[PDB]
Design a protein around this ligand. Structure first.
Ligand SMILES: *[C@@H]1O[C@H](CO)[C@@H](O[C@@H]2O[C@H](CO)[C@@H](O)[C@H](O)[C@H]2NC(C)=O)[C@H](O)[C@H]1NC(C)=O
Ligand SMILES: *[C@@H]1O[C@H](CO)[C@@H](O[C@@H]2O[C@H](CO)[C@@H](O)[C@H](O)[C@H]2NC(C)=O)[C@H](O)[C@H]1NC(C)=O
Ligand SMILES: *[C@@H]1O[C@H](CO)[C@@H](O[C@@H]2O[C@H](CO)[C@@H](O)[C@H](O)[C@H]2NC(C)=O)[C@H](O)[C@H]1NC(C)=O
Ligand SMILES: *[C@@H]1O[C@H](CO)[C@@H](O[C@@H]2O[C@H](CO)[C@@H](O)[C@H](O)[C@H]2NC(C)=O)[C@H](O)[C@H]1NC(C)=O
Ligand SMILES: *[C@@H]1O[C@H](CO)[C@@H](O[C@@H]2O[C@H](CO)[C@@H](O)[C@H](O)[C@H]2NC(C)=O)[C@H](O)[C@H]1NC(C)=O
Ligand SMILES: *[C@@H]1O[C@H](CO)[C@@H](O[C@@H]2O[C@H](CO)[C@@H](O)[C@H](O)[C@H]2NC(C)=O)[C@H](O)[C@H]1NC(C)=O
Ligand SMILES: *[C@@H]1O[C@H](CO)[C@@H](O[C@@H]2O[C@H](CO)[C@@H](O)[C@H](O)[C@H]2NC(C)=O)[C@H](O)[C@H]1NC(C)=O
Ligand SMILES: *[C@@H]1O[C@H](CO)[C@@H](O)[C@H](O)[C@H]1NC(C)=O
Ligand SMILES: *[C@@H]1O[C@H](CO)[C@@H](O)[C@H](O)[C@H]1NC(C)=O
Ligand SMILES: *[C@@H]1O[C@H](CO)[C@@H](O)[C@H](O)[C@H]1NC(C)=O
Ligand SMILES: *[C@@H]1O[C@H](CO)[C@@H](O)[C@H](O)[C@H]1NC(C)=O
Ligand SMILES: *[C@@H]1O[C@H](CO)[C@@H](O)[C@H](O)[C@H]1NC(C)=O
Ligand SMILES: *[C@@H]1O[C@H](CO)[C@@H](O)[C@H](O)[C@H]1NC(C)=O
Ligand SMILES: *[C@@H]1O[C@H](CO)[C@@H](O)[C@H](O)[C@H]1NC(C)=O
Ligand SMILES: *[C@@H]1O[C@H](CO)[C@@H](O)[C@H](O)[C@H]1NC(C)=O
Ligand SMILES: *[C@@H]1O[C@H](CO)[C@@H](O)[C@H](O)[C@H]1NC(C)=O
Ligand SMILES: *[C@@H]1O[C@H](CO)[C@@H](O)[C@H](O)[C@H]1NC(C)=O
Ligand SMILES: *[C@@H]1O[C@H](CO)[C@@H](O)[C@H](O)[C@H]1NC(C)=O
Ligand SMILES: *[C@@H]1O[C@H](CO)[C@@H](O)[C@H](O)[C@H]1NC(C)=O
Ligand SMILES: *[C@@H]1O[C@H](CO)[C@@H](O)[C@H](O)[C@H]1NC(C)=O
Lengths: 404, 211, 420, 198, 49
C-alpha cells in the first residue's frame, strides 16, 4: 500500500494495491514428439539449384528442425528474417515449413523480400507484403558458374512456366555478376497441429500452479488446469472474448487444458491511519476463502505477507475473502466501507473489527387512527453547509511544458 | 434450372474453439439465398466452372455419386486433382490422369492418399496455393431438395498442392442429384454455442437488416 | 409521416367565463431515475500487459498514466456509494411499519415490505427488480449498501411517510392518522380539507386502484424501465468494447502479446509491444474518459433523485410539474436496480363546469373581493367557491373583504352580500 | 475535517499539477526523459525520432490533464450553480423546499466566505418535547361538522382544543377557529363536542 | 450583444469543427499533410509508415 500510494504515511481507508509480490514461477515445455530430422542438409546442399523463373519448392513436415545449426553456419552471407527472429525459431514451431530454392546474380538480393521491386519479383517470385519467414543466401561461383546460360529469369508464389526468357552466362571469372544461391523458408503458423518443431526438449506437465508454459510455440504464463470444454475434434486452441488463449489441447496427450492468469484475486488493504497503527487487514476481491493461498500462490510468497492466508481471523464477505480482521456480530456506523454491507473499524486489546453496517437506530412510530404527537417546544439549530464555488485557475504554456 | 440455397454452406473459419461468442469473420462463403445450379444423374458428369471456389452437395441413398475431378483442362496435360468416396474408403490424388468426357465407376503426381434419405454437403476452395475441403453428412426430412435450415461444415483436408483449378466435374457409378454454387468474399457474423459449435449465422451483405 | 405535436385545442376564453373542476382524480404517476452505475475498477497493468514481464517493465516508462487511471476509476467507484447513500440515507432512524394497517382505507400493502421473501422487497420492488437484466484485469466491485439494505431504507422512508407525514424530515417522526395527513396534503394544494373527508372512501378507492394499475403496467410493459436498463446496457457495452479492443493490432504483427514474445527477439519485440501498449493504453484512457463523463451524467440524476426524495417523500412540493403531472400530494420511493422509482401521488382536477364570473362584487357601494377562491354564478345566483374544486358557498362578509368602491374596478357586478 | 470538501478541491488541483509535473520524468520509450540529453547525444536524423516520442507522450499527458480539468470544472460549476441557488433562495429568501436549506424547517441562512468555496449557516426551527394526544378530523356540534381553519383538534383526555400544527398551543374550539362543512354522517372518525360561539 | 449565450454556443461548435478540419492540414510528422501525395509518390511498404 505505501508503495501503491508512493507515501510513507497512509490515511484511514481501503486501498486497492498494485501487485508487487515476487511470484517466482517456473517453466514448462510441451511439443509433438515425432523423431525424424528435417532435410535441411539436403536443401542447403543440393547438386544444382533451380533457375528463378521456375524455383524449387520443398514442403518440410513431420520432423525436428535445427535452425540453431543453420543460423550458426558460416556459409551464409545473409540470414534476414521477417515476422520472426532467427533465435526464436528454436522455441516457436509450425504446422508446415516451405523451402523455396534458386540461383540469382549476387546483385539481386534486393528483389527477395516482402513486396520488393524489380522484374524477378514482378514476373516470377512475388513475396507477399506480410511474408513470415527467412531469406538465406550465399556465393555459389564455385558450383553454378561454368558460361552457364541455362540460369533463366523473366500473385505471390507463382512459377512463371519476343520471349521473356532472359538468362545469365555465369562464369567463375565473373564480382556482383557471380551466381549466389538463395533459400527462402516460409512458415505456416496456423492453428492446426504443429509438424515442424525446434530442437528444444519437452518437460513433464504441471497443473494447478503458476507456470511459464510453452505449447508448440505459445510461450504464455498462467495456471494450467484440466478442463470440461467440449472441443470439436479438429480444434487445437480455445479463445477468450479478448481473442487470447483460454484453453489448449496438449500435443502429447489429447486432454484439454484451461489457462488462467496468476493472482486474478484483486487485493485491497484495509487500514486505520498509520499515525494510529501499523496493523492492517486484507480483502481478496471475488475469491472464496478456502482458495486464497492457492489463488495468490502463498506457497512462494514472503512470510510476513503469508500471515494473510489462513489464521482463523478469516471472514467470507460477498465481495471476497477478508483476512486479518475480526468478525463482530454487533453493528455500528460505517468507519471504513468494504462492500456488500460490510464495514471495518479499529477498536478495543485493539484489533481491526469487521461488521455488518448499522443503517440507523430502529424505531416504531406509535401510529393509530386517533393518536397525534404535537411538539410543545423547539430548538433553533444552526446547521452548517459547505460548498465548493471555484478551483485554482491554471494556465499552461504548453510549448514550454512540451519543448521548453 | 436453379434452387434457393437458403442458409446453407457455412463452415468453420479456423481450427479454434470459441464458447457462446458472436464472432465476426470475413472469408469466401456461399451467399445466403443464392441461386445454386441443380443437376440429375441422367443423359450427370459435365465440366462446370470452378470460379473463385465451390459449394457442392448431393442427395443420396446408395452412393451413386462417387467422386470429382478438377483442374484447368482435365486431360493429362497437367497434374489434375482426382477424388473418390468408395464405401469403406476415401481416395485423394493429383496426377497427369487421362479420361474421355464421360467417366464412370463400374457397378508430376505430387500427392496420393487413402483412408433421398441423406444429404452430403461440401466446400472446395484454394487460397495462396492451399487447397481445402470442408464437409457434412446428414439425414434429411424434405425428400425433394436442399432443406431450409442451418449446419456448419467441418474441415476434412488442407493440401499445399498449388494447382490453378478453373474447371471441375463430378463422377457417377454406372453399369441421384447434386447442386453447384460459388463462394463470394463476405463478412459473416457467426454464433458459437457453449459446445464450440457454430449454430447460427448472418451474411452481412444480404440486406440492410443483416448489415 | 409529419409528426403530430398533440391534439389541437381552442380554449373557450372570454372576459367573464371560468371553468371550475367539480371533481378530481388522484393519480400515481411513476417516475424512474438512475442513481448509481455498475462500479468498475481496472488493474491497468493487468489489462495492458497480462502478466508479461517485458511489457510490465515497458509500461513503467509511460509513467503515472496507469495509476492516474486507477485513481479516476476509484473516484467514480466511491462516488457511486456516495450517490446511493445521498438518495436513500436521508432518514437517520429505521422506522418500522405498524402491526395494524388502519390507514383510513388507503392500502400500501403492494409497496410495503413482504416478510415472505428472504430479502424483504415489496411487491412493486420485486416487479422492478425483475424488469431489469473477468480475467483481463477488469473487475466489478459490489455496491456498499446491499439490495436488502436499500430496501430497509426505502421501507424506513415509506413507513415514516405513511405514519408521520413530512415531520420525520423536520425532526423525530410524529405519529398522525393517515386521513389527517391527507387533509394536510390537500391544504398544501389549496383544496379545503373537508373535500377529503366528505370523499374519503372515493379517494381511498382511487389511490388503491391506481397502485393496482402500476402492478399491471409493470407486469406487462418492460419498456417503462428504459432509463435503468439503458444505464445497465451502456456500462456492459463499455466493458465489452474495452475487452474487445485487446484483440486489435494497433499496427503490431499480432494483437496477442505472447505471440510477439514467442516470435521476436527483445530489441525487435519492444517496438511491436510499444504499439500494443500505446493502443491498449489509449483505449483505456478512452474508456475512463467515457466513464468520467457518464458518471457526471449519473451524479446529476442522483442529485435530482436526492432532491425529489427530500422535497416529495420527506415533504410536499409546490414546484409545478416537479413531482408528477398534477398538484403534488406525496411520493413513495421504491428501490430498483441501480436506481430509484418514485410513485408520485398527485391530485388532477376533472369534470369541469363553465360559469359566469366577476373579479369583485358591489354591495352598497363597497367593492367586495373573495378571501380565498373566486366568484361564480350558475346563471341566476352568485356564489363564492374555492379555486380547485367546485363548492358553492353563499356570499358573506366572512367569505369576502371590502376595498374601495364600485368606480375603479373593471368588470365588477352587483349582488347582495349577506351579513351573518 | 468539517472543511473536507474545500480542502479536497485544493488537494485535487495540487495533485493534478504534481502528476502533470512528474510525467516530465517519464521517457515514453525515448532514450531519455530530459530533452537536452537527446539533442546533445544524437544528430537530427536520429534525434527527430526520439524527440517525437517525447512530444507525443508529453502532449498525451497534457491532453489528459486538460480533460480532467474540463470534467472537474463541470463538477465545480454544478456546485457553483447549486451554491448560487442557495444564495438566491436561502440567503436572499426563506425556502419552503424540505432539506434544501440545512435540516428542519428553514428560517434564514448567513453566507460566510472560505478558500475556493462558500459556507452557509442555515438557521432552522427543529421541533422538540412531543406530547401524545387523542385527535379527530372533525368536531360535531349541533349536527354540523366543524373543521379547523388552521391546525388540528386534540384532547388532553377531558377537554377538546384546536392547536397549530408545529407548536402545542391549545385554544378553545370556536366558530372563529373552525369552519362548518355539511353534517356529522359523512366523516370517518368524527367526535362530538360543543363548539363555543363568541 | 444581448444573445451572448446562444451566439457563443453557435461560435464554439463552428470553432470546434473548423479546428477539426484545419487539423487535416497538419503533417503529424508525415512527409505531406495530404494523403493523395503519399499514395501517388510512395510505393506501399514505404507509404504505410
Ligand atoms: C490459371 O489458368 C488459366 C487457364 O486455365 C489462365 O487463364 C488465361 O490467362 C491468359 C492471360 O495470362 C488469358 O489470355 C486467357 O484468356 C485466360 N484463359 C481463361 C480460360 O481464362 C490464368 O491466367 C491462370 N491464373 C493465374 C493467376 O495465372
Ligand atoms: C367523481 O368522480 C368519480 C370517479 O373518479 C365518481 O365515482 C364513480 O361513480 C360511478 C357512478 O356515477 C360509479 O359507477 C363508479 O364505480 C365510481 N368510481 C369509484 C372509483 O368510486 C364520482 O361519482 C364522481 N362524483 C361526483 C359528485 O360527480
Ligand atoms: C389491500 O389490498 C390487497 C390486494 O391489493 C388485498 O389482498 C386480498 O386480501 C383478501 C383477503 O382479505 C384475499 O382473499 C385476496 O386473495 C388478496 N388479494 C391479493 C392479490 O393478495 C387486501 O385485503 C387489502 N387490505 C385492505 C385492509 O384493504
Ligand atoms: C342557482 O342556484 C340556486 C341555489 O341553489 C337555485 O335556486 C334554488 O333552485 C331550486 C330548484 O333547482 C329550488 O328548489 C330552490 O327553492 C331555489 N332556491 C331559492 C332561494 O329560490 C337556482 O335555481 C340555480 N339556478 C340555476 C340556473 O341552476
Ligand atoms: C349597480 O346598481 C346601481 C344602483 O344600485 C347602478 O347605479 C346606477 O346606474 C345608472 C346608470 O349609470 C345611473 O344613472 C344611476 O345614477 C346609478 N345610481 C347610483 C346610486 O349610482 C349600477 O349601474 C349597477 N351596475 C351594474 C353593473 O349593474
Ligand atoms: C384539560 O384542560 C382543561 C383546561 O385547561 C382542564 O380543565 C381545567 O382544570 C383545572 C384543574 O387542573 C380547573 O381548575 C379548571 O377549572 C378546569 N377548567 C375547565 C373549563 O373545566 C382539564 O383539567 C385538563 N385535563 C387534563 C387531564 O389535563
Ligand atoms: C354524537 O352524539 C349523538 C347524540 O348527540 C349520537 O347520536 C345517537 O347515537 C345513538 C347510537 O347510534 C343512536 O341510538 C341515537 O338515536 C343517536 N341520537 C341522535 C339524536 O342522533 C352519536 O352517535 C355521537 N357520535 C359519536 C361519534 O360519538
Ligand atoms: C554439405 O555437404 C558437405 C559434403 O558434401 C558436408 O561437409 C557439409 O557439412 C554439408 N553442409 C550442410 C549444411 O549440409
Ligand atoms: C509421446 O511419447 C510417448 C513415449 O514417450 C508415446 O507413447 C506417445 O505415443 C507420444 N505421443 C503421441 C501423441 O504420439
Ligand atoms: C496523529 O496521531 C496523534 C495520536 O497518536 C494525534 O494526536 C494527532 O492529532 C494525529 N495527527 C494527524 C495529522 O492525524
Ligand atoms: C468455497 O470453496 C469450498 C471448497 O474449497 C466449497 O465447498 C464452498 O462451497 C465454496 N464457497 C463459496 C461461498 O464459494
Ligand atoms: C456470532 O453469532 C453466531 C450465530 O449467528 C454465534 O454462533 C457466534 O458464537 C457469535 N460470535 C460472537 C463473537 O458473538
Ligand atoms: C435467380 O436468377 C434469376 C434469373 O435466372 C433471377 O430472376 C432471380 O432474381 C435470382 N434469385 C434471386 C434470389 O435474386
Ligand atoms: C477404394 O479405392 C482404392 C483405390 O482407388 C482401393 O485401394 C480400395 O480397396 C477401394 N475400396 C473399396 C471398398 O472399393
Ligand atoms: C511432368 O512434367 C514433364 C514436363 O515438365 C512431362 O514431360 C511429364 O510427362 C509429366 N509427368 C507425367 C507423369 O506425365
Ligand atoms: C452440448 O453437448 C451436450 C452433450 O455432450 C448436449 O446435451 C447439450 O444439449 C449441448 N448444448 C448445446 C448448446 O448444443
Ligand atoms: C364551456 O362553454 C363553451 C361555449 O362555447 C364550450 O365550447 C366549452 O366546450 C364548454 N366547456 C366545458 C368544459 O363544458
Ligand atoms: C367583455 O367583452 C365585450 C365585447 O366582446 C365587452 O363589450 C364587455 O364590456 C367585456 N366585459 C368585461 C366584463 O370585460
Ligand atoms: C405515545 O404513546 C405510546 C403508547 O404506547 C408510547 O409508546 C409512545 O412512546 C408515546 N410517545 C410519546 C412521544 O410520548
Ligand atoms: C381505530 O382502531 C381500532 C383498533 O386499533 C378500531 O377498533 C377502531 O374502530 C378504529 N377507529 C376508527 C375511527 O377508525
Amino acid at each position: 500500500t505505501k508503495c501503491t500510494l508512493k507515501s510513507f504515511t497512509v490515511e484511514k481507508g481501503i486501498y486497492q494495491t498494485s501487485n508487487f509480490r515476487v511470484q517466482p514461477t517456473e517453466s514448462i515445455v510441451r511439443f509433438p514428439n515425432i523423431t525424424n530430422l528435417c532435410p535441411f542438409g539436403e536443401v542447403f546442399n543440393a547438386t544444382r539449384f533451380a533457375s528463378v523463373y521456375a524455383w524449387n519448392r520443398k514442403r518440410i513436415s513431420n520432423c525436428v528442425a535445427d535452425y540453431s545449426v543453420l543460423y550458426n553456419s558460416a556459409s551464409f552471407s545473409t540470414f534476414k528474417c521477417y515476422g520472426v527472429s532467427p533465435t526464436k525459431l528454436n522455441d516457436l514451431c509450425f504446422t508446415n515449413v516451405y523451402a523455396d530454392s534458386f540461383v540469382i546474380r549476387g546483385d539481386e538480393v534486393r528483389q527477395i523480400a516482402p513486396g520488393q521491386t524489380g522484374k524477378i519479383a514482378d514476373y516470377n517470385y512475388k513475396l507477399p507484403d506480410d511474408f513470415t519467414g527467412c531469406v538465406i543466401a550465399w556465393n555459389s561461383n564455385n558450383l553454378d558458374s561454368k558460361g552457364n546460360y541455362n540460369y533463366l529469369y523473366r500473385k505471390p508464389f507463382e512459377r512463371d512456366i519476343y520471349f521473356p526468357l532472359q538468362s545469365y552466362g555465369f562464369q567463375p571469372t565473373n564480382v556482383g555478376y557471380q551466381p549466389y544461391r538463395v533459400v527462402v523458408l516460409s512458415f505456416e503458423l496456423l492453428h492446426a497441429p504443429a509438424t515442424v518443431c525446434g530442437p528444444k526438449k519437452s518437460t513433464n506437465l504441471v497443473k494447478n500452479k503458476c507456470v511459464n508454459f510453452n505449447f508448440n510455440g505459445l510461450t504464455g504464463t498462467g495456471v494450467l488446469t484440466e478442463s470440461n470444454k467440449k472441443f470439436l475434434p479438429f480444434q487445437q486452441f480455445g479463445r477468450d472474448i479478448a481473442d487470447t488463449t483460454d484453453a489448449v489441447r496438449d500435443p502429447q496427450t489429447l486432454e484439454i487444458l484451461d489457462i488462467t492468469p496468476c493472482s486474478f484475486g484483486g487485493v485491497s488493504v484495509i487500514t486505520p491511519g498509520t499515525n494510529t497503527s501499523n496493523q492492517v487487514a486484507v480483502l481478496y476481491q471475488g475469491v472464496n476463502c478456502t482458495e486464497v493461498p492457492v489463488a495468490i500462490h502463498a506457497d512462494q510468497l514472503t512470510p510476513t505477507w503469508r500471515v494473510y492466508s489462513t489464521g482463523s481471523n478469516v471472514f467470507q464477505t460477498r465481495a471476497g475473502c477478508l483476512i486479518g480482521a475480526e468478525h463482530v456480530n454487533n453493528s455500528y456506523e460505517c468507519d471504513i466501507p468494504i462492500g456488500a454491507g460490510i464495514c471495518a473499524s479499529y477498536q478495543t486489546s485493539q484489533s481491526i473489527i469487521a461488521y455488518t453496517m448499522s443503517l440507523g437506530a430502529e424505531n416504531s412510530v406509535a401510529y393509530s387512527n386517533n393518536s397525534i404527537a404535537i411538539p410543545t417546544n423547539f430548538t433553533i439549530s444552526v446547521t452548517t453547509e459547505i460548498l465548493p464555488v471555484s478551483m485554482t485557475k491554471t494556465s499552461v504554456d504548453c510549448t514550454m511544458y512540451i519543448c521548453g | 434450372a436453379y434452387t434457393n440455397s437458403f442458409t446453407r454452406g457455412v463452415y468453420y473459419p479456423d481450427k479454434v474453439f470459441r464458447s457462446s461468442v458472436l464472432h465476426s469473420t470475413q472469408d469466401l462463403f456461399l451467399p445466403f439465398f443464392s441461386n445454386v445450379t441443380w443437376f440429375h444423374a441422367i443423359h450427370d458428369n459435365p465440366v462446370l466452372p470452378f470460379n473463385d471456389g465451390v459449394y457442392f452437395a448431393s442427395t443420396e441413398k446408395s452412393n451413386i455419386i462417387r467422386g470429382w475431378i478438377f483442374g484447368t483442362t482435365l486431360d493429362s496435360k497437367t497434374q489434375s486433382l482426382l477424388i473418390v468416396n468408395n464405401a469403406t474408403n476415401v481416395v485423394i490424388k493429383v496426377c497427369e490422369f487421362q479420361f474421355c468426357n464421360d467417366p464412370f465407376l463400374g457397378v508430376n503426381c505430387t500427392f496420393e492418399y487413402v483412408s433421398f434419405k441423406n444429404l452430403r454437403e461440401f466446400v472446395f476452395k484454394n487460397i495462396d496455393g492451399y487447397f481445402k475441403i470442408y464437409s457434412k453428412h446428414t439425414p434429411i426430412n424434405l425428400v425433394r431438395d436442399l432443406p431450409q435450415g442451418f449446419s456448419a461444415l467441418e474441415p476434412l483436408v488442407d493440401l499445399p498442392i498449388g494447382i490453378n483449378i478453373t474447371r471441375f466435374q463430378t463422377l457417377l457409378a454406372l453399369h441421384a442429384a447434386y447442386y453447384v454454387g460459388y463462394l463470394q468474399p463476405r463478412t459473416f457474423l457467426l454464433k458459437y454455442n457453449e459446445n464450440g459449435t457454430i449454430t447460427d449465422a448472418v451474411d452481412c451483405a444480404l440486406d440492410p437488416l443483416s448489415e | 409521416y409529419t409528426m403530430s405535436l398533440g391534439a389541437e385545442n381552442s380554449v373557450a376564453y372570454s372576459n367573464n367565463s371560468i371553468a371550475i373542476p367539480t371533481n378530481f382524480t388522484i393519480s400515481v404517476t411513476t417516475e424512474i431515475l438512475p442513481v448509481s452505475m455498475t462500479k468498475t475498477s481496472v488493474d491497468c497493468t493487468m489489462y495492458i500487459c497480462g502478466d508479461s514481464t517485458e511489457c510490465s517493465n515497458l509500461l513503467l516508462q509511460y509513467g503515472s498514466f496507469c495509476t492516474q487511471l486507477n485513481r479516476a476509476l476509484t473516484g467514480i467507484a466511491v462516488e457511486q456509494d456516495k450517490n446511493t447513500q445521498e438518495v436513500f440515507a436521508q432518514v437517520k432512524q429505521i422506522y418500522k411499519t405498524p402491526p395494524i394497517k388502519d390507514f383510513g382505507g388507503f392500502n400500501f400493502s403492494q409497496i410495503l415490505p413482504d416478510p415472505s421473501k428472504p430479502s424483504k422487497r415489496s411487491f412493486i420492488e420485486d416487479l422492478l427488480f425483475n424488469k431489469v437484466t473477468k480475467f483481463n484485469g477488469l473487475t466489478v466491485l459490489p455496491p456498499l449498501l446491499t439490495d436488502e439494505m436499500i430496501a430497509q431504507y426505502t421501507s424506513a422512508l415509506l413507513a415514516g411517510t405513511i405514519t408521520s407525514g413530512w415531520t420525520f424530515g423536520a425532526g423525530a417522526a410524529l405519529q398522525i392518522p393517515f386521513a389527517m395527513q391527507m387533509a394536510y396534503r390537500f391544504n398544501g394544494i389549496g383544496v379545503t380539507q373537508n373535500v377529503l373527508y366528505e370523499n374519503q372512501k372515493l379517494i381511498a378507492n382511487q389511490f388503491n386502484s391506481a397502485i393496482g394499475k402500476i402492478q399491471d403496467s409493470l407486469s406487462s410493459t418492460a419498456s417503462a424501465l428504459g432509463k435503468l436498463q439503458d444505464v445497465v446496457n451502456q456500462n456492459a457495452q463499455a466493458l465489452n468494447t474495452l475487452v474487445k479492443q485487446l484483440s486489435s493490432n494497433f499496427g503490431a504483427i499480432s494483437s496477442v502479446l505472447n505471440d510477439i514474445l514467442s516470435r521476436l527477439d527483445k530489441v525487435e519485440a519492444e517496438v511491436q509491444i510499444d504499439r500494443l501498449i500505446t493502443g491498449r493504453l489509449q483505449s483505456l484512457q478512452t474508456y475512463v474518459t467515457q466513464q468520467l463523463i457518464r458518471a457526471a451524467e449519473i451524479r446529476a440524476s442522483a442529485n435530482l433523485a436526492a432532491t425529489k426524495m427530500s422535497e416529495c417523500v420527506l415533504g410536499q412540493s409546490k414546484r409545478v410539474d416537479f413531482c408528477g403531472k398534477g398538484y403534488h400530494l406525496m411520493s413513495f420511493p421504491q428501490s430498483a436496480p441501480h436506481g430509484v422509482v418514485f410513485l408520485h401521488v398527485t391530485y388532477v382536477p376533472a369534470q369541469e363546469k363553465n360559469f359566469t364570473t366577476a373579479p369583485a362584487i358591489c354591495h352598497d357601494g363597497k367593492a367586495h373581493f373573495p378571501r380565498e377562491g373566486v366568484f361564480v354564478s350558475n346563471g341566476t345566483h352568485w356564489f363564492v367557491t374555492q379555486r380547485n374544486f367546485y363548492e358553492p358557498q353563499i356570499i358573506t362578509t366572512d367569505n369576502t373583504f371590502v376595498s374601495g368602491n364600485c368606480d375603479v374596478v373593471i368588470g365588477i357586478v352587483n349582488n347582495t352580500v349577506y351579513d351573518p
